[PDB]
Design an enzyme around this catalytic site. Structure first.
Site, PDB file in Angstrom:
ATOM      1  N   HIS A 224       0.846  -1.225   0.000  1.00  0.00           N
ATOM      2  CA  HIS A 224       0.000   0.000   0.000  1.00  0.00           C
ATOM      3  C   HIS A 224       0.871   1.261   0.000  1.00  0.00           C
ATOM      4  O   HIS A 224       0.742   2.089   0.920  1.00  0.00           O
ATOM      5  CB  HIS A 224      -0.995  -0.047   1.151  1.00  0.00           C
ATOM      6  CG  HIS A 224      -2.096  -1.016   0.910  1.00  0.00           C
ATOM      7  ND1 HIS A 224      -2.166  -2.219   1.559  1.00  0.00           N
ATOM      8  CD2 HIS A 224      -3.151  -0.971   0.070  1.00  0.00           C
ATOM      9  CE1 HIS A 224      -3.240  -2.871   1.151  1.00  0.00           C
ATOM     10  NE2 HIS A 224      -3.860  -2.123   0.241  1.00  0.00           N
TER      11      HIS A 224
ATOM     12  N   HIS B   2      -6.056   7.313  -3.333  1.00  0.00           N
ATOM     13  CA  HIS B   2      -7.067   6.383  -2.760  1.00  0.00           C
ATOM     14  C   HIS B   2      -6.531   5.603  -1.548  1.00  0.00           C
ATOM     15  O   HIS B   2      -7.372   5.079  -0.816  1.00  0.00           O
ATOM     16  CB  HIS B   2      -7.636   5.423  -3.812  1.00  0.00           C
ATOM     17  CG  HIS B   2      -6.778   4.230  -4.057  1.00  0.00           C
ATOM     18  ND1 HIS B   2      -5.616   4.305  -4.777  1.00  0.00           N
ATOM     19  CD2 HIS B   2      -6.913   2.944  -3.675  1.00  0.00           C
ATOM     20  CE1 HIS B   2      -5.065   3.108  -4.833  1.00  0.00           C
ATOM     21  NE2 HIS B   2      -5.838   2.252  -4.151  1.00  0.00           N
ATOM     22  N   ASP B   3      -5.214   5.502  -1.339  1.00  0.00           N
ATOM     23  CA  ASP B   3      -4.632   4.768  -0.178  1.00  0.00           C
ATOM     24  C   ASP B   3      -3.698   5.692   0.630  1.00  0.00           C
ATOM     25  O   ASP B   3      -2.851   5.172   1.387  1.00  0.00           O
ATOM     26  CB  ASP B   3      -3.924   3.488  -0.637  1.00  0.00           C
ATOM     27  CG  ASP B   3      -4.824   2.264  -0.788  1.00  0.00           C
ATOM     28  OD1 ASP B   3      -5.808   2.134  -0.046  1.00  0.00           O
ATOM     29  OD2 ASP B   3      -4.489   1.418  -1.602  1.00  0.00           O
TER      30      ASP B   3
ATOM     31  N   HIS C  50       1.827   1.593  -5.756  1.00  0.00           N
ATOM     32  CA  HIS C  50       0.418   1.128  -5.861  1.00  0.00           C
ATOM     33  C   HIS C  50      -0.466   2.281  -6.359  1.00  0.00           C
ATOM     34  O   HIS C  50      -1.246   2.065  -7.302  1.00  0.00           O
ATOM     35  CB  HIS C  50      -0.052   0.580  -4.522  1.00  0.00           C
ATOM     36  CG  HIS C  50      -1.501   0.239  -4.507  1.00  0.00           C
ATOM     37  ND1 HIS C  50      -2.034  -0.769  -5.286  1.00  0.00           N
ATOM     38  CD2 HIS C  50      -2.521   0.759  -3.800  1.00  0.00           C
ATOM     39  CE1 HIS C  50      -3.330  -0.857  -5.040  1.00  0.00           C
ATOM     40  NE2 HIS C  50      -3.650   0.064  -4.132  1.00  0.00           N
TER      41      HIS C  50
ATOM     42  N   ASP D 120      -8.019  -0.896  -8.568  1.00  0.00           N
ATOM     43  CA  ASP D 120      -7.395  -1.286  -7.280  1.00  0.00           C
ATOM     44  C   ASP D 120      -6.864  -2.720  -7.325  1.00  0.00           C
ATOM     45  O   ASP D 120      -5.803  -2.962  -6.732  1.00  0.00           O
ATOM     46  CB  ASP D 120      -8.407  -1.143  -6.157  1.00  0.00           C
ATOM     47  CG  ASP D 120      -7.771  -0.881  -4.815  1.00  0.00           C
ATOM     48  OD1 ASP D 120      -6.553  -0.591  -4.777  1.00  0.00           O
ATOM     49  OD2 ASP D 120      -8.510  -0.958  -3.832  1.00  0.00           O
TER      50      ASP D 120
ATOM     51  N   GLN E 107      -5.622 -17.814  -3.784  1.00  0.00           N
ATOM     52  CA  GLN E 107      -5.655 -17.009  -5.035  1.00  0.00           C
ATOM     53  C   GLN E 107      -6.850 -17.460  -5.892  1.00  0.00           C
ATOM     54  O   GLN E 107      -7.625 -16.581  -6.313  1.00  0.00           O
ATOM     55  CB  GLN E 107      -4.314 -17.081  -5.769  1.00  0.00           C
ATOM     56  CG  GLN E 107      -3.199 -16.289  -5.087  1.00  0.00           C
ATOM     57  CD  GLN E 107      -3.423 -14.792  -5.123  1.00  0.00           C
ATOM     58  OE1 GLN E 107      -3.717 -14.203  -6.157  1.00  0.00           O
ATOM     59  NE2 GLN E 107      -3.323 -14.161  -3.965  1.00  0.00           N
TER      60      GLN E 107
HETATM   61  C1  LIG Z   1      -3.962 -10.343  -5.813  1.00  0.00           C
HETATM   62  N1  LIG Z   1      -4.719  -9.358  -5.021  1.00  0.00           N
HETATM   63  N2  LIG Z   1      -4.916  -8.042  -5.381  1.00  0.00           N
HETATM   64  C2  LIG Z   1      -5.609  -7.457  -4.458  1.00  0.00           C
HETATM   65  C3  LIG Z   1      -5.877  -8.336  -3.426  1.00  0.00           C
HETATM   66  C4  LIG Z   1      -6.700  -7.931  -2.243  1.00  0.00           C
HETATM   67  O1  LIG Z   1      -7.635  -8.620  -1.884  1.00  0.00           O
HETATM   68  N3  LIG Z   1      -6.519  -6.765  -1.596  1.00  0.00           N
HETATM   69  C5  LIG Z   1      -7.406  -6.365  -0.472  1.00  0.00           C
HETATM   70  C6  LIG Z   1      -6.589  -6.132   0.797  1.00  0.00           C
HETATM   71  O2  LIG Z   1      -5.602  -5.193   0.382  1.00  0.00           O
HETATM   72  C7  LIG Z   1      -4.670  -5.719  -0.592  1.00  0.00           C
HETATM   73  C8  LIG Z   1      -5.391  -5.896  -1.947  1.00  0.00           C
HETATM   74  C9  LIG Z   1      -5.296  -9.543  -3.812  1.00  0.00           C
HETATM   75  C10 LIG Z   1      -5.297 -10.806  -3.076  1.00  0.00           C
HETATM   76  O3  LIG Z   1      -4.343 -11.563  -3.140  1.00  0.00           O
HETATM   77  N4  LIG Z   1      -6.395 -11.098  -2.372  1.00  0.00           N
HETATM   78  C11 LIG Z   1      -6.590 -12.243  -1.615  1.00  0.00           C
HETATM   79  C12 LIG Z   1      -7.890 -12.455  -1.097  1.00  0.00           C
HETATM   80  C13 LIG Z   1      -8.191 -13.526  -0.328  1.00  0.00           C
HETATM   81  N5  LIG Z   1      -7.229 -14.438  -0.060  1.00  0.00           N
HETATM   82  C14 LIG Z   1      -7.262 -15.583   0.690  1.00  0.00           C
HETATM   83  C15 LIG Z   1      -6.002 -16.089   0.612  1.00  0.00           C
HETATM   84  C16 LIG Z   1      -5.527 -17.291   1.298  1.00  0.00           C
HETATM   85  C17 LIG Z   1      -6.428 -18.158   1.909  1.00  0.00           C
HETATM   86  C18 LIG Z   1      -5.918 -19.269   2.574  1.00  0.00           C
HETATM   87  C19 LIG Z   1      -4.556 -19.481   2.668  1.00  0.00           C
HETATM   88  C20 LIG Z   1      -3.680 -18.589   2.093  1.00  0.00           C
HETATM   89  C21 LIG Z   1      -4.164 -17.493   1.418  1.00  0.00           C
HETATM   90  N6  LIG Z   1      -5.226 -15.288  -0.121  1.00  0.00           N
HETATM   91  C22 LIG Z   1      -5.953 -14.269  -0.553  1.00  0.00           C
HETATM   92  C23 LIG Z   1      -5.608 -13.146  -1.352  1.00  0.00           C
HETATM   93 MG   LIG Z   2      -7.416   0.881   0.101  1.00  0.00          MG
HETATM   94 ZN   LIG Z   3      -5.512   0.373  -3.108  1.00  0.00          ZN
END
Ligand SMILES: Cn1ncc(C(=O)N2CCOCC2)c1C(=O)Nc1ccn2cc(-c3ccccc3)nc2c1
Ligand SMILES: [Mg+2]
Ligand SMILES: [Zn+2]
Length: 313
Positions: free
Chosen positions: A68, A106-107, A72, A217, A269
């Protein structure tokens, strides 16, 4: 006035594409943003001196956190640039001005922690802003910077146009609260399918701008696989630091934030692409057909995460 920003040839060409990566040269990012404002909005829409001073104050108010951060902010602004340039005639002069600035801001002053951690920690911001805690903070920081001497990039707008642009920016920044995305996309999906979607209806435009903000985002999922994969490392660096801080409050973090469950990232993912990313770019492509390259890139990356699980990487 006759002072254009010009990028080297490879950047001049690739900056127009959705999957552009702004590169590792921090000192070129301000120029990349001004370039996008000039091509998206016009060389006249901001006084260069005021814009440059706003950009550098915004940069200074982003923190040295893994994800963040200032990169970004500029990354999310570029995705918005690409959407706006591929939908020339769909957006007003004030929307083009407001939305690139909204994305840059935005962040603002993000600490690398979720709304959920602020509430469990009992951070002052959680008392000041009960919902969309960090997002109300980001908007408050945007207004604070606009009110510094020589930082008011909207000075030459009428009082009416000024209240409208700050309103576009506030809604756009609040919409980056992913907790609000699920309901926004459902309503848009309903409206598109019943044919009730009307871009002359302000509250409909607001919803479409909100989905654009979510799309910009989450845009790491729309890059070339190596950018996506390497951005994911920065995302988990923050998630896992937050998980460590949950364990310090005596709270078991969700697996997403638990570095012990590193093993399960690939499946996490898949859930994210299927639950959040793919539906986002699907609805956006329905409403704005020229944003289809975002959906195509997202699907390509879903297929890469599926190969990781199947032990093909
Ligand atoms: C690529 N990308 N881009 C933005 C975001 C995002 O959500 N943001 C919001 C929070 O702020 C960062 C951006 C992501 C992302 O990877 N999301 C997520 C969402 C939910 N998950 C559950 C798990 C996971 C579950 C079990 C074990 C290990 C991992 N891993 C994830 C990654
Ligand atoms: Mg944000
Ligand atoms: Zn953001």
């Amino acid at each position: 006035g006759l002072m254009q920003f010009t990028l080297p040839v490879r950047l001049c060409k690739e900056i127009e594409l959705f999957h552009f990566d702004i590169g590792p040269f921090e000192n070129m990012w301000p120029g990349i943003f001004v370039y996008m404002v000039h091509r998206s909005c016009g060389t006249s829409c901001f006084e260069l001196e005021k814009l440059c001073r706003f950009i550098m104050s915004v940069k200074k108010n982003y923190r040295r956190v893994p994800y963040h951060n200032w990169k970004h902010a500029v990354t999310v602004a570029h995705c918005m640039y690409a959407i706006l340039q591929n939908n020339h005639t769909l957006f007003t002069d004030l929307e083009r001005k407001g939305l690139l600035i909204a994305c840059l801001c935005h962040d603002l002053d993000h600490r690398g922690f979720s709304n959920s951690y602020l509430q469990k920690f009992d951070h002052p911001l959680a008392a000041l802003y009960s919902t969309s805690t960090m997002e109300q903070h980001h908007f408050s920081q945007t207004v604070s910077i606009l009110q510094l001497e020589g930082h008011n990039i909207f000075s030459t707008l009428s009082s009416s146009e000024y209240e409208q642009v700050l309103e576009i920016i506030r809604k756009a920044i609040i919409a980056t609260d992913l907790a609000l995305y699920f309901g926004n996309r459902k309503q848009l999906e309903e409206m598109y399918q019943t044919g009730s979607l009307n871009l002359n209806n302000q509250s409909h435009r607001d919803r479409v701008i909100g989905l654009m903000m979510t799309a910009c985002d989450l845009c790491s999922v729309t890059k070339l696989w190596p950018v996506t994969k390497l951005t994911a490392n920065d995302i988990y660096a923050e998630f896992w630091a937050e998980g460590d801080e949950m364990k310090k409050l005596g709270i078991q973090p969700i697996p997403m934030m638990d570095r012990d469950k590193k093993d399960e990232v690939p499946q996490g993912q898949l859930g994210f692409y299927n639950a959040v990313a793919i539906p986002c770019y699907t609805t956006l492509t329905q409403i704005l057909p020229p944003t289809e390259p975002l959906l195509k890139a997202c699907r390509d990356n879903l297929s890469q995460w599926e190969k990781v699980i199947r032990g093909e990487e």
